[PDB]
Design a binder for this molecule. Structure first.
Ligand SMILES: CCCCCCCCCCCCCCCCCC(=O)OC[C@H](COP(=O)(O)OCCN)OC(=O)CCCCCCCCCCCCCCCCC
Ligand SMILES: CCCCCCCCCCCCCCCCCC(=O)OC[C@H](COP(=O)(O)OCCN)OC(=O)CCCCCCCCCCCCCCCCC
Lengths: 68, 90, 308, 344, 96, 104, 98, 83, 114, 171
């Protein structure tokens, strides 16, 4: 009956869900538990390069804070 | 570098599939259509920068010019219509 | 990590196409009062692999009067575009975060005419060239509205980026407004993908090329429905729940891709002349009118959006 | 062709040169040229015959290549100076490429081979425009940059144009090719005097226009596109000879007639500038234009050729063609030497 | 609803740009000091790199203006690493 | 131009975005704004023959700031001498040029 | 910049060479014309982006529009030539020599 | 009135699409003059600070310009909030 | 012709902030009111006198009066600020729309202790 | 990656050379498509996002498309063209090598002049606002609607009148 197309619908649904959460997790992993910073203009790129330069390990996502 | 990688990967995959495939074993109407499509695609080119034009101060001017564009495009369409350019009855 | 992300993006969409074939067959069967595939595997989940093996194991009878170059680079191009379209899609975070992403979609979609035309010019005949010219004209014509609809709907979010529509629909879908623009967008996706009732090009290739064309077709189907979901049916985005966004996006895209097949089983075909009259006399007037309406709306309303 | 189409095409034909002359931006000048081309082609091809199609194709290709070269010149100047206008600092090669392109747009030699073919394949009211109204924008672009041009190549082009125009008109038996070569010659005179005084280029331009328009109208009176067809004018319409002869002599440049003054004053300026050898060559080779204009004055007004019979019924019929502009322009072009100090 | 939402979006954009405003001075001073130090390093190197050449004034401007002329990124990262040059040119156009 | 109907009617269709020193949309400065401004302001009122000779220092400055041939040549001479010295073993690059330093 | 501009100018020159040298077709000349158009578009956009002169970006757009119109009328003329003779050849336009 | 209204009903029956297109055209060209919320668009797009507000010298005679962001002598767009 | 003039390395040497973008952004709206005068003076020098080499005496004061701000912040009311900018740095556009209540915490804390 | 834009410009050169040499109206279309792809790539390298994507979506998707369309419907491939195609492919090879020698001689004759091979990776970007928003290319191409409305009316009129012109030419 109509409930025999689900074995395929759910397969396709899982295959369509994988990309999103995979990309999100990989971003959080490669960028220090934070989102991947976007750069639509030069100001954000400048902020990013500046964070990278002050890190001391050449990585924009190593936030330093007040301690330094 | 990332876009390059992705497109290269896709091309490689396509060529690999199509290799495995082998290794396992006159009417003027269409021309007029193309021309109309040109004259509308160039209008798209002139129309695309509206998301940046509507951020300006001269709103009374952008309103005007966009209306001019759309109106005269519609008029050209109507004329191509009246003159039996959208018929296909040879 | 990036190559791993690319794999995670590519493999599942191909699996999803291969199983969308089966879903189509089963749905059409149950709408025709029959089952569809049941045997090869439990409920048929092996039939697509069986068909792939069969095709790729056949023997290619390459037309003798032809050109190998245009014979090989047409399906290569089709699949390359059908895969590179899925790249910028925010689901919710994109593999490649582009500005002007919808423009990249427009262009990489409009680039398929070249293959759908080179195949015909390669096949040395006149009937195939007739069919190719007609299909090219159809696709071309509907690209116009496919572009203007977005040109008018991207003024509720002042940017050509796909990662802005999430916050644009953070409170309400872009369907309630522009439901007349969707109804015209939902259809140009059929005619663009030569999908019934706009299949006047498949209603002349070896196993492998036919398979690549099939893959491209169904991939483009899923992607067009995904664009519909992202634009006119903005799903939920709680900053901490990309899982939620992806679940909802999947659900809506499956709804839409099943609607396509609903339609294929429900309606007859069109006649090329009437198909072109449809656009050039019903969709283009309304499209231009609503374009002017949506250029004026953000003005006589103070709701003109930002440029971030 | 319906009124709306006519209006749009002719408004474009009119707007092209107007933008060219009223714009400071070379891009807008180029725009005007493109308008002119786009809106001229359909009128050429109206009849839809092989000859008209071929003429249209030749015109399109030539003018499009020329426009591309002009736009290259503009882009190079833009990369060189940041401005969209030629100054006193542009690499002379840019300006010489521009001059080659403008010369091919006009029809100067050795960039002239297309003009007679096109004019022949084209009807009369279209040759009129092509040879009078389509010389004003490309000449304006030059008038705007006359201080920074190359007299050497300008004079070579002008003298080549004089020579080839004479040696073409000597042979052609077709009204339209004769007019084409006359245009070539007068445009050569213009270019010659340009870098020293452009007011005289404009003088000769208006003189040549006043002299050409009424001639094409005379022809269109009977659609006499040939010598043996215009010879019957003594039986068809003999009240036009007294003026065809005078206008042809003026074109030739005979002293007592308007058409003289251009050559005379241009030679004067060239003498003030010590271009006497070139002025002499040109003045001696204009006599061939005068020759093959006298050969037509003969067959038209000083001797009667064998006529035909149905010309009797042509006499029976009346006519209302030659509007007032014919007489006005012919008089202004034949009897206006006493007013030369004002036209100068 | 779209009007009432995009107006709040405008207010938020103004807030972000105001933060940018408040920050800019710090950034401009830091950038000036950075580029000045870059040019000073390049000069202090050129001094000895080009000592034995004939008729070479060390620090010779190509202008007769006497005023400040912002340097080119080529001038700055010309003696530095090619990866630095590539980050300067194809660094923002290459998706973060 | 050839027919100053624009200046007659006191309007501007094409004569406000000709050169670099003109008005840009969001006040964004162009590269050679000051050099071109100076050249124009100094050549205003003496047009042509004079400005080609007694307004030439400023045109040279504009040409250099726009085309940069002299700067290119300078940097190239420096790099050539440096390559020769490194090849022959009479000079070594410093750390910040080699690729390592303490940044700001 | 210098190198890419030199190569762009060489390409324009090559396409003009192709135009001035026919090879029995006419499409192969219209395509050279469009190559010229493309080279000029690219050079103009590149100079605009190099100088940061955002008051000159409409120029590529305009020239693209007008090149499109020129190409359209050229294609129409070619279509008529084919409709009449049977080929987009150039030896068939031997008329007007009399 | 009668003849033209019958024409409009004939249209409304035959080609509703053309009617809707033309009516949307008219609405677009007309409503921006009726609406009161129009001016606010230019007001906002002016109020957006994409650039640095370069200050000026306190040369004495300038009482209607503040010396600190938090003074009421300058403009204040509370109307945006109230919007 | 003309020997360019530059400043030495001993100078243009100052205690930088070494603080990150999210932090500067969480502290901007207060750093725009406090420490405004010595910022406007510098952004007037740098625009009147087009040379940066003529505003180092002002850029150093900028850095100093910014360190004093970030030192007041540490002395009093460090934890709300820490959590606020930690929540900010999570996003990509570093948006103020998600961290609205931690911002109220920072604001109340600073308004009470300062 | 210093050689990036140089490689792109060289590919554009080779495409325009394969145009100059005239294989056929279809392989010429393919050459045009390649050259346009490369032109967009180099425009993006120079920062022209909008310009390059517009090239993509209009020049290729709109112009070369109708070029190939009109070609197929109004052109016939004759058998002779194949031997001559191979001949002009060899011609193309020879031209490539001649261009290489040309570039070598020009580098030998002008170090910092025609092409600064030493400074290849340099002299691509001269200046840029680092802390600046609102400096993309759309901000300029959208000037048309506020300043330079003259260009917009010009272009719209060209397109408008093209309709009448083409209907009258084809008819
Ligand atoms: C034999 C079979 C042949 C079939 C081949 C078919 C291949 C076609 C594949 C589809 C074509 C895709 C077109 C790619 C255009 C990229 C447009 C784009 O948006 O990239 C711009 C990118 C980001 O810039 P932006 O978004 O403006 O802002 C970023 C600031 N954060 O900034 C950048 O510029 C990124 C660098 C550009 C990368 C583009 C590379 C595209 C893929 C290259 C394909 C090469 C194929 C082989 C050669 C083709 C023929 C010569
Ligand atoms: C003062 C200072 C001097 C300055 C230098 C002066 C330059 C020289 C002046 C040259 C003026 C004439 C030159 C052109 C000669 C024209 C030849 C001509 O018209 O005669 C031929 C023709 C004969 O026609 P046919 O068929 O033989 O029989 C008569 C029927 N009309 O004749 C015709 O058919 C004519 C048309 C008939 C119209 C009816 C008759 C009305 C009169 C028309 C002729 C007017 C001529 C005016 C002469 C004034 C001379 C100054």
């Amino acid at each position: 009956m109509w409930f025999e197309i689900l074995p395929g619908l759910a397969i396709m649904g899982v295959c369509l869900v994988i990309p999103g959460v995979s990309t999100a997790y990989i971003h959080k992993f490669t960028n220090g538990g934070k989102e991947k910073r976007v750069a639509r203009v030069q100001y954000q790129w400048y902020l990013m390069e500046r964070d990278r330069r002050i890190s001391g390990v050449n990585r924009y996502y190593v936030s330093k804070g007040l301690e330094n | 570098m990332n876009l390059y990688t992705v497109i290269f990967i896709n091309i490689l995959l396509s060529l690999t599939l199509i290799l495995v495939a082998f290794w396992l074993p006159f009417s003027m109407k269409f021309f007029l259509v193309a021309i109309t499509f040109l004259l509308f695609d160039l209008e798209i080119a002139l129309l695309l920068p509206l998301p940046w034009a509507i951020q300006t101060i001269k709103t009374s001017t952008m309103m005007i010019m966009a209306f001019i564009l759309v109106t005269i495009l519609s008029l050209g369409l109507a004329y191509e219509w009246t003159q039996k350019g959208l018929e296909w009855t040879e | 990590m990036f190559f791993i992300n690319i794999l995670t993006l590519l493999v599942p969409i191909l699996i999803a196409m291969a199983f969308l074939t089966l879903v189509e067959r089963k749905i059409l069967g149950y709408m025709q009062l029959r089952k569809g595939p049941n045997i090869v595997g439990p409920y048929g989940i092996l039939q697509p692999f069986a068909d792939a093996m069969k095709l790729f194991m056949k023997e290619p009878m390459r037309p003798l009067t032809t050109s190998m170059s245009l014979f090989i680079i047409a399906p290569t191009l089709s699949l390359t575009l059908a895969l590179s379209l899925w790249v910028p899609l925010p689901m919710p975070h994109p593999l490649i975060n582009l500005n002007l992403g919808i423009l990249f979609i427009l262009a990489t979609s409009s680039l398929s005419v070249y293959s759908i035309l080179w195949s015909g010019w390669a096949s040395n005949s006149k009937y195939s060239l007739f069919g190719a010219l007609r299909a090219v004209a159809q696709t071309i014509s509907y690209e116009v509205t496919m572009a203007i609809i977005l040109l008018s709907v991207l003024l509720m979010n002042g940017s050509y980026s796909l990662q802005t529509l999430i916050t644009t629909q953070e409170h309400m879908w872009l369907l309630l407004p522009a439901w007349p623009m969707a109804m015209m967008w939902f259809i140009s996706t059929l005619a663009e993908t030569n999908r019934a009732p706009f299949d006047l090009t498949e209603g002349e290739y070896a196993a492998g090329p036919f398979a690549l064309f099939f893959m491209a077709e169904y991939t483009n189907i899923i992607l067009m429905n995904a664009l519909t979901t992202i634009i006119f049916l903005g799903p939920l985005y709680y900053i901490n729940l990309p899982e939620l966004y992806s679940t909802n996006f999947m659900m809506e895209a499956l709804l839409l891709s099943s609607t396509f097949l609903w339609i294929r089983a429900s309606y007859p075909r069109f006649r090329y002349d009437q198909l072109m009259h449809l656009l050039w006399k019903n969709f283009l007037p309304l499209t231009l009118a609503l374009c002017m309406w949506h250029i004026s709306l953000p003005i006589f309303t103070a709701g003109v959006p930002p440029y971030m | 062709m319906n009124p709306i189409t006519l209006a749009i095409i002719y408004f474009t034909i009119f707007l092209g040169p107007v933008i060219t002359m009223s714009s400071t931006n070379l891009m807008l000048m180029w725009v005007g040229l493109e308008f002119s081309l786009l809106a001229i082609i359909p009128m050429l091809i109206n009849k839809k015959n092989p000859r008209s199609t071929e003429a249209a194709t030749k015109y399109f290709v030539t003018q499009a290549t020329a426009s591309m070269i002009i736009l290259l010149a503009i882009v190079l100047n833009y990369k060189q100076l940041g401005t969209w206008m030629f100054q006193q600092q542009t690499n002379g090669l840019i300006l010489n490429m521009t001059l080659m392109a403008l010369s091919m747009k006009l029809g100067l030699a050795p960039f002239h081979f297309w003009l007679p073919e096109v004019t022949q394949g084209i009807p009369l009211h279209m040759g009129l425009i092509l040879l009078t109204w389509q010389k004003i924008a490309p000449l304006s672009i030059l008038i705007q940059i006359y201080p920074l041009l190359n007299s050497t190549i300008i004079l070579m082009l002008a003298i080549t144009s004089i020579f080839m125009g004479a040696w073409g008109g000597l042979n052609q038996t077709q009204m339209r090719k004769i007019m084409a070569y006359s245009s070539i010659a007068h445009m050569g005179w213009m270019l010659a005097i340009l870098p020293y005084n452009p007011s005289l280029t404009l003088l000769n331009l208006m003189i040549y226009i006043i002299l050409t328009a009424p001639m094409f109208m005379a022809l269109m009176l009977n659609n006499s596109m040939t010598i043996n067809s215009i010879s019957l004018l003594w039986n068809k319409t003999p009240a036009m000879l007294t003026m065809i002869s005078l206008m042809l002599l003026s074109l030739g440049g005979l002293p007592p007639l308007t058409g003289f003054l251009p050559k005379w004053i241009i030679i004067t300026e060239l003498m003030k500038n010590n271009c006497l050898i070139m002025a002499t060559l040109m003045a001696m080779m204009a006599l061939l234009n005068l020759f093959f204009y006298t050969r037509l004055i003969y067959s038209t007004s000083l001797t009667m050729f064998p006529t035909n019979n149905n010309s009797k019924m042509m006499t029976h019929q009346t006519k209302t063609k030659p509007n007032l502009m014919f007489s006005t322009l012919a008089i202004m072009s034949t009897m206006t030497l006493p007013l030369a100090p004002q036209l100068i | 609803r779209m009007m009432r939402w995009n107006q709040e979006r405008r207010r938020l954009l103004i807030e972000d740009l105001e933060a940018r405003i408040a920050l800019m001075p710090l950034f401009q001073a830091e950038k000036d000091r950075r580029t000045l130090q870059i040019l000073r390093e390049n000069l202090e190197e050129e001094a000895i790199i080009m000592k034995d050449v004939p008729n070479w004034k060390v620090g010779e401007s190509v202008f007769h203006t006497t005023r400040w002329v912002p340097p080119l990124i080529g001038e700055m990262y010309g003696l530095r690493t090619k990866e630095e040059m590539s980050n300067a040119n194809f660094g923002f156009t290459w998706y973060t | 131009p050839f027919l100053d109907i624009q200046k007659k009617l006191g309007i501007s269709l094409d004569r406000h975005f000709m050169f670099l020193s003109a008005e840009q949309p969001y006040k964004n400065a162009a590269r050679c704004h000051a050099f071109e401004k100076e050249w124009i302001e100094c050549a205003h009122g003496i047009g042509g023959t004079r400005a080609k000779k007694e307004c030439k220092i400023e045109f040279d400055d504009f040409e250099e700031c726009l085309l940069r041939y002299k700067t290119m040549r300078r940097m190239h001479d420096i790099k050539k001498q440096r390559e020769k010295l490194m090849k022959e073993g009479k000079y070594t690059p410093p750390p910040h040029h080699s690729g390592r330093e303490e940044p700001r | 910049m210098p190198s890419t501009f030199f190569n762009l100018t060489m390409a324009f020159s090559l396409s003009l060479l192709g135009t001035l040298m026919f090879r029995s077709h006419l499409m192969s000349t219209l395509l050279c014309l469009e190559g010229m158009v493309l080279s000029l578009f690219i050079m103009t956009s590149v100079t605009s982006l190099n100088s940061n002169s955002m008051s000159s970006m409409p120029i590529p757009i305009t020239i693209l529009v007008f090149a499109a119109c020129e190409a359209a009328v050229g294609l129409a003329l070619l279509v008529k030539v084919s409709n009449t003779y049977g080929t987009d050849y150039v030896q068939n336009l031997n008329l007007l020599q009399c | 009135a009668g003849r033209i209204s019958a024409f409009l009903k004939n249209a409304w029956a035959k080609e509703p699409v053309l009617v809707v297109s033309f009516s949307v055209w008219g609405l677009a060209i007309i409503m921006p003059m009726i609406s009161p919320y129009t001016k606010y668009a230019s007001m906002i797009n002016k109020a957006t600070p994409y650039n640095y507000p370069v200050p000026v010298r306190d040369d004495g005679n300038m009482p209607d310009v503040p010396s600190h962001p938090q003074d009421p002598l300058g403009p204040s767009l509370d109307w945006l909030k109230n919007l | 012709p003309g020997i360019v003039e530059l400043p030495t390395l001993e100078e243009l040497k100052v205690e930088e902030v070494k603080v990150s973008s999210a932090v500067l952004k969480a502290a901007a709206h207060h750093y725009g009111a406090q420490c405004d005068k010595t910022n406007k003076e510098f952004m007037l020098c740098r625009w009147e006198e087009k040379d940066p080499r003529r505003c180092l005496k002002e850029g150093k004061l900028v850095n100093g009066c910014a360190l004093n701000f970030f030192r007041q912040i540490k002395s009093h009311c460090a934890e709300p600020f820490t959590e606020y900018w930690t929540c900010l740095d999570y996003s990509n556009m570093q948006l103020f729309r998600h961290c609205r209540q931690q911002q109220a915490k920072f604001d109340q804390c600073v308004l009470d202790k300062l | 990656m210093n050689n990036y834009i140089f490689v792109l410009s060289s590919l554009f050169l080779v495409g325009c050379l394969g145009l100059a040499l005239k294989p056929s109206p279809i392989y010429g279309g393919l050459g045009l498509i390649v050259s346009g792809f490369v032109g967009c790539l180099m425009v993006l390298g120079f920062g022209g996002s909008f310009l390059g994507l517009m090239v993509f979506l209009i020049y290729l998707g709109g112009m070369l498309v109708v070029f190939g369309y009109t070609t197929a419907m109004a052109t016939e491939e004759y058998p002779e063209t194949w031997g001559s195609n191979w001949l002009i492919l060899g011609f193309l090879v020879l031209g490539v090598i001649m261009e290489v020698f040309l570039i070598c001689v020009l580098n030998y004759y002008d170090e910092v002049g025609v092409i600064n091979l030493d400074g290849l990776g340099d002299w691509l970007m001269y200046e840029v606002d680092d802390v600046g928003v609102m400096l993309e290319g759309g901000i300029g191409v959208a000037a048309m609607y506020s300043c330079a409305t003259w260009m917009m009316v010009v272009a719209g009129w060209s397109l408008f009148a093209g309709i009448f012109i083409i209907i009258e030419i084809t008819r």
